[PDB]
Design a protein around this ligand. Structure first.
Ligand SMILES: Nc1ncnc2c1ncn2[C@@H]1O[C@H](COP(=O)(O)OP(=O)(O)OP(=O)(O)O)[C@@H](O)[C@H]1O
Lengths: 827, 393, 98
């Protein structure tokens, strides 16, 4: 009856959504420089309609009284889209080229870095008989990559026969690039080469035939989208000893497509603090620095902001001193406040903003919003990547149709794709084995915040900013920050998300239940426990309550039929309500071992990651129940009171799981009567940790074999005894990037540190960067340096009575950077 | 009273003037001082059954195992069966009822001490039975519960309950039984003593001995103890911290910095000091900030505040002694062995002079600083003012 | 009730004003020699319409009876906008070098 017309209109809305998203993606490709203002205004209005109809369709999906409301809203938004239609019909060089021409005696700190680039390629030019090699230089935004290549280039040209710079832009024309290569080789024979119009191929043949019996040193820079470089590499495919190539790029996934060797990849780092200070004082300051003595702290704090990027500091210095330091200690602070939120809205600085937006424009779709989402988080802090992944999934930024992907690995791939585009610095390694958190450069972060605020993507309340938009109704994302004064929340009815950063004003001034529709709720670090209204929120996906003093949670959580996250670390709650099996969709459950889980967990079939499951006073059915739901990828378990044949029951029921990637079991000072020696492990596994040290195994587990579980890269194992064949067996394993073994009896009984030996094989360690042995003697005279090619640190124990022995054959420099080690010695 | 600093001098031929009295008098018999009998507990092991019969009508098993405890106390049993019989009740009991429950356990554990101090228990048997993990947490809860039962009541009115230290508890004459459990175990297994201290301090926090509104980020979690043991077995892990360890260092330095301040609140500073001092005492070299300590005199501030707590504890003990002549605690001194109200002549010659030197001892090697003055000087002055206005009465 | 339709039509007025000044600025760049006179006439007419719309929105914003006056005026100006719409679709060296 009435349901049929709305059920029919919904997919019409969906088709319109697809068309609008297509045109929005097309119009956002062009830089906001060639795009006329009329098309841009129309695009903004289209974007607003896009949000409104997404909200209507989502309301329909979650709800199905209300049908009348949905129908009325649908007719209204149709009228709006119609009316917007006829308005539109009714009313209708490279910025970095100059840098290339800069005075040589204007670059500070260049010579040493240039020498490092030269002698990593010309060391084989001595005996220039080696096969040709390419040296790739990587970096982010602009930090000397092209200049350094030219300094090196202009230095070593007497000892070759040819050579040229060629640049490749964002969207090259291959014939143009090839004509540029031909022109630079010889400008006489190929003087009018840009007029000849053959093809992409005959001129490749000509360039090949030209470079026979010659050493040249061709350098190509700014190569993006590796598929473009696979054309040029065919021009360089005949044997030519003593010839070399240089490549510069912002994509670190294209550099390994060159030179096939990680030692040839040149990661280059920002300038050091003192070098950056010297450059900064060379531009503004004439010859001395001892005059101010009052803005020195200001210069320190400014140089900290730019970090090390020769570009940022060059631009800021040019802005700061037009003629004899036209500004002093007041507008310096005004600039400092302006950066972070609004610095770029200025003059002579917009030059560099295009150089930074190059990378943002090169991003494909489905990644522009993911990058723009970073504007939510504050200026300088590490951002846990798991938080970003779950927030992205809950927001709707991640989606697919393949059904062979668990929609989480997809988000991880998006994050890694952001990393390799040289836009966010990854730092640290988490407990799951991947990047822990990420940090974004200060200039880039402030620049993207402005770009996001050009539309209504987010809204930030900041004391330095202290600014509000004119339309309170059209607010979707809010980021409360240190500001705690103007907390008006009246006319934000369709609020997509909200998050609060370390504020005690929350709750007493905030009223969140008033947000009838809400998709994620993030409450890191707050001190509020009054959660009794989340039952009213039915669109919620992400609910973060880490460190929130939440003592208890409402019984009616089961109503939140759509839900994907519950983070409950650091909370005061110790028992979950029974109304949690009622949840049908979930992917993560971050709980601590103290809390007690109600029975019925086996119904949460869609669960993807489980963390810190406490097994205390558990019956057999509950232990067996975890095995029916097989979608886990990460599982963390600890226990105190079930150490019986139930252990073997669980150990067998785990093997039902076929998608694990990590595992770790925690137990106090006991033999592991859980893992049985006749049991198949999951086919896929990477981490397999065991962080307890008071615990031990009697023997090396039998199921540990090179045959099964071939993808391991981490052990953290501990055993009572040790054998000289166990180490050899561990050497049969393929990857095992990380190594750690503990000898329990050594630290607990009167046991002597013996010297195990690898008798069989040659290397048994192709790739193990880290190796740790505690209570086990790993003498470095176990094999010549041709055994473990990559091993940055090694730990072992050396008894003092072996000083007089002859088995201590160290002193030679092994292949990896193994000259830093402090071995624990025992008398 | 604005009593000035008790300036005295403790040298030779004056040490034994008061210590000789302390060598035979009722107090200080099982204690020590900074300047440096089976019938008594048999009578209580007999009187364990005073009020139990009164409220039997629910309570019957209390009397039933009181009888069993008294039977085991006097009967001689070979060590390989006595321990099993006495653990029959240690490993069965779970929880006005609970006051009588701990008294069964508290007197039960003293039997092992009583037989071990009588050479009836072989050292090897005790070493083999102390490795049990259950008894470590068991004794950890019993010690703190018994202490907060009796001495907390007297300390709260004394004003010194704010300066109660977890590790500085074996000094009590009633709790003279923990010296063996500490020394034998630590010279036989260093790790286990640190483990049991960690558990005991966690129980102290959770039981209100050092309350707070914030969760314990070093106690009540297995991750923490695993990481601390790994650090204790690796001398070069601070140099290159791994996962779950950067945050521990961050939190410990926040605690140290908060302690280092002067104008922030006092209770949180004392709590942070308690946890941190326990941390070094059971885990050496965890906070070796060799750069900040030199510029902060932090390392010496540790001894300053620890000696402040020590002297305040001794002052509390002297107060509870002088007012007695039941503040000594329940099941501490029986009715017959009680000390009457009349004054004794030996006190005028060994108490005022003894407390006079005690204060001087602590006020002879303590540094003075604005941060320490509110942590050491002010408590010392208030203690002196209160202790010099109650001796004559 | 009544004020709601006026309030929700006002923002449509601002939006289409922004588009009209966009067009006017775009056409005003080219000198009055390469511009065909049909565009000139249409541009003049839309300029007058833009003045009318600005007066209406200004009167609303300064004021808040008159609600009905401005409602009639708004629907009326939109009507000339519609009529001016389809008329447009119905019909379609350097001097100092010497
Ligand atoms: N060591 C230096 N001293 C002084 N100025 C420098 C130094 N290195 C680079 N610059 C200047 O900083 C600007 C950075 O441009 P650069 O040549 O680094 O671009 P790039 O590294 O190729 O990056 P992009 O990939 O964005 O082109 C240029 O003006 C360059 O001259």
């Amino acid at each position: 009856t009435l349901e049929k017309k709305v059920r029919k209109g919904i997919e019409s809305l969906i088709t319109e959504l697809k068309l609008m998203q297509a045109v929005l993606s097309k119009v956002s490709k062009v830089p906001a420089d060639q795009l006329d203002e009329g098309v841009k205004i129309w695009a903004g209005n289209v974007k607003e309609l896009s949000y409104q109809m997404e909200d209507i369709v989502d309301a329909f999906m979650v709800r199905v009284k209300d049908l009348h409301r949905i129908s009325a809203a649908l007719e209204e938004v149709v009228l709006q889209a119609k009316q917007l239609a006829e308005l539109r019909q009714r009313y209708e060089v490279d910025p970095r080229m100059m840098a290339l021409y800069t005075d040589v005696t204007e670059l500070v700190g260049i010579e040493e870095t240039r020498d490092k680039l030269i002698n990593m390629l010309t060391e084989g030019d001595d005996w220039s008989k080696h096969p040709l090699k390419t040296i790739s230089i990587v970096g982010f935004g602009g930090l000397g990559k092209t200049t350094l290549a030219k300094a090196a280039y202009d230095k070593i040209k007497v000892q070759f026969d040819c050579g040229a710079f060629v640049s490749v832009s964002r969207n090259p024309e291959m014939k143009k690039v090839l004509k540029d290569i031909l022109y630079g080789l010889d400008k006489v024979k190929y003087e009018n080469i840009h007029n000849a119009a053959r093809d992409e191929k005959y001129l490749i043949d000509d360039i090949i035939e030209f470079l026979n019996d010659k050493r040249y040193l061709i350098v190509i820079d700014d190569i993006w989208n590796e598929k473009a470089w696979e054309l040029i590499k065919c021009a360089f495919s005949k044997k030519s000893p003593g010839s070399r190539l240089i490549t510069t790029t912002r994509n670190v996934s294209v550099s390994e497509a060159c030179c096939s060797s990680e030692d040839d990849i040149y990661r280059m780092e920002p300038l050091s603090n003192d070098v950056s200070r010297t450059l900064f004082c060379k531009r503004i300051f004439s010859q001395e620095e001892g005059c101010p003595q009052e803005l020195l702290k200001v210069s320190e704090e400014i140089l900290k902001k730019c970090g090390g990027v020769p570009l940022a500091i060059i631009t800021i210095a040019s802005l700061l001193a037009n003629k004899g330091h036209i500004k002093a200690k007041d507008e310096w602070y005004a600039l400092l406040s302006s950066i972070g939120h609004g610095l770029t809205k200025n003059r002579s600085l917009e030059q560099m903003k295009k150089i930074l937006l190059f990378s943002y424009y090169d991003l494909p779709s489905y990644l522009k919003p993911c990058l723009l989402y970073l504007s939510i988080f504050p200026e300088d802090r590490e951002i846990r990547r798991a938080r970003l992944i779950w927030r992205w999934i809950s927001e709707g930024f991640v989606y697919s149709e393949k059904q062979d992907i668990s929609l989480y690995e997809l988000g991880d791939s998006y994050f890694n794709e952001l990393v390799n585009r040289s836009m966010i610095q990854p730092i640290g390694i988490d407990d799951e084995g991947k990047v822990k958190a990420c940090r974004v450069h200060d200039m880039v972060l402030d620049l993207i915040c402005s770009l996001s605020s050009e539309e209504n993507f987010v809204t930030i309340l900041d004391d330095p900013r202290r600014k509000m938009p004119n339309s309170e109704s059209k607010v979707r994302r809010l980021s409360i920050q240190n500001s705690k004064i103007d907390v008006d929340t009246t006319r934000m009815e369709h609020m997509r998300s909200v998050t609060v950063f370390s504020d005690n004003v929350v709750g007493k001034v905030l009223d969140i239940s008033r947000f009838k529709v809400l998709r994620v709720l993030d409450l890191e670090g707050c001190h509020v426990s009054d959660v009794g209204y989340v039952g009213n929120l039915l669109h919620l996906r992400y609910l973060g309550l880490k460190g929130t003093h939440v003592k208890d949670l409402p019984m009616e959580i089961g109503k939140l039929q759509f839900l994907l996250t519950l983070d409950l670390r650091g909370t005061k709650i110790e028992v979950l309500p029974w109304s949690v099996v009622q949840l049908r969709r979930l992917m993560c459950l971050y709980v601590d071992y103290g809390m007690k889980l109600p029975s019925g967990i086996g119904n949460l079939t869609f669960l993807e990651v489980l963390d810190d499951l406490g097994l205390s006073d558990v019956d057999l059915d509950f232990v067996k129940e975890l095995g029916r739901l097989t979608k886990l990828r990460v599982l963390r378990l600890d226990f105190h009171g079930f150490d019986q044949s139930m252990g073997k029951a669980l150990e067998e029921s785990i093997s039902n799981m076929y998608k694990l990637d990590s595992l770790d079991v925690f137990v106090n000072r006991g033999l592991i009567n859980c893992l049985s020696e006749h049991w198949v492990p999951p086919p896929r596994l990477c981490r397999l940790a065991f962080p307890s040290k008071r615990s031990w195994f009697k023997t090396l587990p039998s199921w540990i074999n090179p045959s099964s579980l071939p993808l391991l890269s981490y052990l953290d194992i501990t055993l009572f005894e040790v054998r000289s064949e166990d180490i050899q067996l561990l050497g049969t394993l393929p990857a095992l990037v990380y190594l750690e073994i503990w000898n329990y009896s050594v630290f607990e009984e009167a046991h002597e540190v013996e010297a195990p030996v690898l008798s069989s094989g040659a290397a048994l360690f192709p790739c193990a960067t880290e190796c740790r042995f505690i209570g086990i003697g790993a003498v470095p005279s176990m094999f010549p340096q041709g055994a473990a090619p990559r091993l940055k640190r090694l730990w072992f124990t050396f008894p003092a009575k072996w000083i007089s022995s002859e088995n201590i054959g160290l002193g030679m420099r092994h292949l990896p950077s193994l000259q830093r080690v402090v071995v624990d010695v025992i008398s | 009273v604005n009593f000035p600093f008790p300036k005295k001098m403790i040298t030779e031929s004056n040490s034994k003037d008061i210590r000789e009295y302390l060598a035979s008098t009722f107090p200080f018999e099982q204690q020590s001082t900074i300047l440096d009998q089976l019938k008594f507990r048999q009578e209580n092991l007999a009187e364990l059954k005073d009020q139990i019969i009164l409220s039997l009508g629910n309570w019957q098993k209390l009397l039933d195992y009181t009888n069993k405890l008294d039977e085991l106390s006097n009967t001689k049993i070979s060590p390989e069966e006595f321990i099993e019989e006495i653990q029959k009740v240690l490993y069965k009991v779970k929880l006005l009822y609970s006051q009588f429950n701990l008294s069964i356990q508290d007197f039960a554990l003293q039997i092992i001490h009583s037989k071990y101090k009588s050479n009836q228990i072989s050292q090897n048997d005790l070493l083999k039975l102390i490795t049990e993990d259950e008894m470590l947490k068991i004794l950890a809860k019993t010690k703190v519960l018994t202490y907060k039962m009796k001495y907390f009541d007297s300390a709260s009115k004394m004003g010194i309950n704010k300066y109660i230290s977890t590790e500085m508890m074996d000094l009590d004459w009633q709790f003279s039984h923990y010296k063996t459990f500490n020394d034998a175990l630590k010279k036989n297994k260093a790790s286990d003593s640190s483990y049991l201290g960690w558990l005991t301090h966690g129980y102290s926090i959770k039981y209100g001995l050092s309350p707070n509104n914030e969760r314990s980020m070093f106690f009540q979690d297995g991750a923490k103890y695993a990481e601390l043991y790994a650090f204790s077995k690796s001398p070069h892990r601070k140099i290159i911290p791994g996962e779950h360890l950067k945050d521990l260092l961050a939190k410990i330095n926040k605690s140290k910095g908060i302690f280092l301040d002067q104008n922030a609140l006092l209770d949180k500073r004392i709590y942070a000091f308690h946890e941190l001092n326990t941390l070094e005492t059971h885990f050496p070299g965890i906070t070796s900030s060799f750069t900040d300590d030199l510029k902060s005199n932090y390392r010496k501030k540790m001894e300053s505040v620890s000696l402040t707590c020590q002297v305040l504890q001794e002052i509390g003990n002297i107060h509870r002694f002088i007012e007695s002549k039941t503040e000594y605690g329940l099941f501490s001194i029986p009715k017959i062995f009680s000390i009457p109200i009349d004054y004794k002549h030996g006190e005028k010659e060994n108490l005022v002079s003894y407390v006079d030197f005690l204060y001087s001892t602590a006020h002879e090697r303590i540094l003075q600083d604005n941060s320490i003055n509110q942590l050491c000087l002010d408590p010392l002055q208030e203690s002196l003012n209160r202790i010099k206005s109650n001796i004559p009465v």
